Amino acid sequence: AKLVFFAEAAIIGLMV
Numbered sequence: 001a002k003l004v005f006f007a008e009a010a011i012i013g014l015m016v
Contacts, residue, residue, distance in 0.1 A: 001015045001016055002015075002016055003015055003016075004016050
């Protein structure tokens with residue numbers, strides 16, 4: 001899985 005750093009603002013990382 002890759003670490004996607006999303007910016008929803010709240011920056012959030014996701015292990016996809």
